[PDB]
């Protein structure tokens, strides 16, 4: 899009790459629902997490085991292997809390909300913004 290519073969390859990206996203959706990132122990910003409907579906898949995968995600949010993992978990928790009231309650019970709020005043300004979003999501329910 930014750099126009004269060759039509470039356009065909771009279309094929878009189709392959869609196919990969189709496979990645199953991993997001099954909590592949949680199982592997490394967390990244899930496209399903960013979508409130997809995040709610993933939580329901976790909720099929009484939020066991959601409990693991909350525990990873409390303590994560990598700083990116913590920010991704906080963003996913905020999105799930917005989509589902039970997610906010689970996050508060795991007490990872306080740790995220502390990380908001901490470094990693991107993670700080994600943690501020999580704190705002929690306070929306908290506020009368």
């Amino acid at each position: 899009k930014a750099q126009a290519w004269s060759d039509e073969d470039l356009l065909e390859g771009l279309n094929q790459l878009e189709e392959g990206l869609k196919d990969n996203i189709k496979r990645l959706s199953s991993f997001d629902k099954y909590k592949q990132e949680v199982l592997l122990g490394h967390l990244d910003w899930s496209p399903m997490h960013k979508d409130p409907l997809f995040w709610r579906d993933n939580i329901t898949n976790f909720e099929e085991n009484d939020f066991q995968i959601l409990r693991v995600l909350l525990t990873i949010l409390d303590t994560s292997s990598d700083p990116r993992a913590l920010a991704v978990a906080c963003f996913d928790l905020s999105q799930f809390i917005q989509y589902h009231p039970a997610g906010r309650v689970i996050v508060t019970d795991l007490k990872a909300k306080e740790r995220v709020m502390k990380l908001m005043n901490h470094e990693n300004t991107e993670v700080t913004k994600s943690a501020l979003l999580c704190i705002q999501r929690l306070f929306l329910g908290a506020k009368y």
Partner: protein, 713 residues
């Protein structure tokens, strides 16, 4: 000295060359693609993307200006702005929720406090309805007036104190609203009471039967409001902490977006060549400076590292690229003046450099005050010295023009210094030069100044006009006549300079015989016509006739017919004048006829018709305007001196003299440095425009067009 250039450059390398030439550049490409199609042009998709990026940058800059911050990448900036906006909206929502909870807490606290009073009122007044709610203290009269029969005298509303404005349920700004609980009897009456309470808008919460439950609810609402306010404050603080760096990044993004938009516009204007796979660029660049384009091309090729090398060429064409001579700090004002006087062709002569002194030369001749003029020059020099700060400190309105014209103003004041020295009115007052008195009255010791002998100037001021002969009481008329006569000669000289410039430009135009056919007759004729009078003035100065004063020339020219001519200083001036008149009459058609005849032989004049007489009248008008301006300046200086003398003489006490001197100084400054100065400058400028329009360059051009970044340069 510029020319057109055409080149084909690969797009990838063209990006680097365009980025390098953005700040100053040499050539500016025509908008061939936009003319062909504004829609999607050649790279107008990229132009639209850059426009969206610039719109996002403008929104972020507006938010930062509201915030007050110091002010791929575009996407990140948009995301940061959206995050800050979302944080602000969440904080506002939390503040509104805190206001609602404060309203509920206040209503419940008022109900709990007034529960005992309500019980007492129910016992005194009285399957009873509940009319719990609120009634604003400000709207207490309206609530009492409305539904008076509904109360029936057995219902009493215990309004809250509402000393502090109770936060509204929806308005965080809060309002002076109280809380009142009434008794409800009758279904329609209760419904009307509820509707009135809702329309009241006061801070209202349901009142529990037990006062303890209401107090607990109020405490819970207050705690929730405090928690929401704290969360909103924390979010706003984090948003601002990020927004400081966001604003710095946006400040850099101002120049970034400027460069990106300039590149996009240049690409949209240009039309690429698909066959050569290199974008084709044709722009107006300085032909002399175009030799250095190889450096930018090599830098772009090396940075891009592409082996393919673009070729830059210049194509000859009939179209004339608008060009401007290089202007220094001093030359900028003259260039601006020339631009005001339209434009000129590259080969066309530009007298702007000459005018950069002539306009100061005429303005000095026009008028000048030695004192304030020196002070004005000193102020201008201080401004020029502090221009470093003036570069940082943006000027306002006329200050901006003064910043550009500092050099011209300084030159004009420098010339006016010598002008005042000639006028001898130092600080708008005559001063003795060299001797104790520059001019005095020889002999006539007892005779008054109004005598036959009167005054004899045995010694004459060598640096300026003799004060006895000029500045004295009765010397004014002859001095003014002499000033007008000298202004006439100055105008004749200006016309001669214009004719010389026209001849020079014609030589530059390189016409084989057309120059002699057109400029030579148009010039010289009126020049000698006025020169006859100028030489008559010189001859009169030599002979020194007295009774006619400066009107001897008027008396001589009063008879265009032959014969008489007794006053003629030159022995043959009469026959010579008749011969000159005949020569001018013969030359009059020669100014108009030969050029169209030559054009017809090869194969405007009507404007040129009467234009010579009109121009001579205009030159005489300019000379008279200069004389009048000088006389007015002298009169103003005399008035100021008279006021100062009156204040000083009639003030034995220091205070009266000081007050008078201050008032006179303020008035004289306002009159001269502002009013007289502006009027003289405008008149001198107008005379300069007339003289230049007569001389040459006839407008007909435009300014040099490079692809320079306006913000960067």
């Amino acid at each position: 000295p510029m020319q057109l250039v055409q080149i084909i450059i690969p797009i990838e390398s063209a990006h680097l060359t365009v980025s390098y030439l953005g700040e100053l550049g040499l050539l500016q490409f025509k908008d061939l693609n936009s003319e062909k199609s504004p829609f999607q042009r050649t790279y107008a998709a990229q132009i639209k993307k850059c426009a969206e990026m610039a719109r996002k940058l403008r929104f972020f800059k507006e938010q930062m200006l509201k915030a007050g911050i110091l002010s791929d990448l575009e996407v990140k900036l948009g995301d940061l702005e959206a995050e800050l906006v979302e944080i602000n909206a969440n904080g506002d929502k939390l503040q509104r929720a805190h206001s609602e909870l404060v309203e509920y807490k206040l209503v419940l606290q008022k109900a709990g406090e007034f529960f005992s009073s309500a019980l007492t009122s129910a016992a005194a007044q009285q399957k009873l309805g509940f009319i719990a709610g609120l009634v604003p203290r400000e709207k207490s009269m309206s609530f009492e007036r409305m539904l008076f029969r509904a109360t029936r005298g057995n219902v009493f509303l215990r309004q809250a104190v509402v000393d502090e404005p109770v936060v509204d349920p929806v308005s965080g700004e809060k309002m002076e609203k109280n809380v009142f609980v009434v008794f409800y009897s009758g279904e329609r009456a209760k419904n009307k009471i509820l509707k009135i309470c809702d329309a009241f808008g006061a801070n209202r919460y349901p009142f529990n039967e037990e006062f303890d439950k209401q107090a607990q609810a109020i405490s819970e609402v207050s705690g929730r409001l405090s928690e929401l306010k704290t969360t909103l404050d924390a979010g706003l603080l984090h948003r601002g902490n990020l927004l400081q760096t966001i604003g710095d990044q946006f400040e850099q993004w101002n120049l970034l977006v400027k460069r990106e938009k300039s590149i996009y516009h240049t690409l949209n204007m240009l039309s690429l060549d698909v066959t050569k796979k290199c974008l084709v660029g044709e722009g107006w660049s300085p032909v002399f400076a175009t030799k250095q384009i190889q450096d930018a091309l090599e830098r772009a090729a090396f940075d891009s590292n592409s082996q393919v090398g673009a070729i830059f060429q210049v194509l000859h064409t009939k179209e004339s690229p608008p060009t401007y001579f290089r202007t220094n700090k001093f030359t900028s004002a003259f260039q601006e003046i020339v631009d005001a006087y339209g434009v000129a062709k590259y080969r066309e002569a530009n007298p702007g450099v000459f005018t950069i002194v002539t306009f100061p030369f005429l303005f000095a001749v026009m008028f000048g005050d030695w004192g304030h003029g020196i002070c004005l020059l000193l102020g201008t020099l201080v401004l020029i010295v502090r221009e470093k700060k003036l570069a940082s400190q943006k000027l306002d309105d006329i200050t901006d023009m003064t910043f550009g014209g500092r050099y011209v103003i300084l030159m004009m004041a420098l010339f006016s210094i010598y002008t005042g020295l000639i006028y001898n009115e130092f600080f708008s007052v005559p001063f003795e030069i060299f001797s104790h008195s520059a001019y005095a009255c020889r002999d006539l010791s007892c005779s008054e100044a109004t005598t036959v002998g009167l005054i004899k100037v045995r010694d004459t001021y060598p640096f300026g006009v003799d004060p006895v002969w000029h500045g004295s009481r009765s010397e004014l008329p002859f001095l003014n006549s002499l000033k007008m006569k000298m202004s006439i000669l100055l105008g004749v000289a200006q016309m001669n300079l214009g004719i010389i410039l026209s001849y020079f430009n014609a030589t530059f135009f390189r016409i084989g015989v057309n120059i002699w056919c057109q400029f030579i007759p148009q010039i010289i004729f009126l020049n000698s016509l006025f020169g006859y009078l100028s030489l008559l003035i010189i001859l009169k100065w030599i002979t020194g006739s007295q009774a006619d004063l400066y009107h001897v020339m008027i008396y001589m020219f009063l008879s265009p017919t032959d014969e008489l001519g007794d006053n003629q200083l030159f022995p043959g001036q009469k026959t010579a004048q008749l011969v000159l008149l005949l020569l001018a009459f013969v030359s009059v058609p020669w100014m108009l006829l030969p050029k169209p005849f030559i054009l017809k032989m090869q194969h405007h004049q009507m404007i040129h018709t009467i234009e010579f007489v009109l121009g001579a009248v205009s030159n005489t008008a300019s000379y008279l305007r200069l004389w009048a301006l000088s006389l007015a300046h002298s009169e103003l200086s005399s008035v100021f001196y008279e006021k100062v003398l009156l204040l000083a003489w009639g003030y034995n006490n220091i205070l009266i003299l000081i007050v008078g001197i201050i008032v006179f100084i303020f008035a004289t400054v306002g009159v001269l440095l502002v009013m007289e100065t502006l009027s003289a400058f405008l008149h001198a400028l107008r005379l300069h425009w007339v003289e230049f329009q007569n001389k040459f360059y006839e407008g007909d051009g435009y300014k040099f067009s490079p692809f320079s970044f306006a913000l960067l340069d």
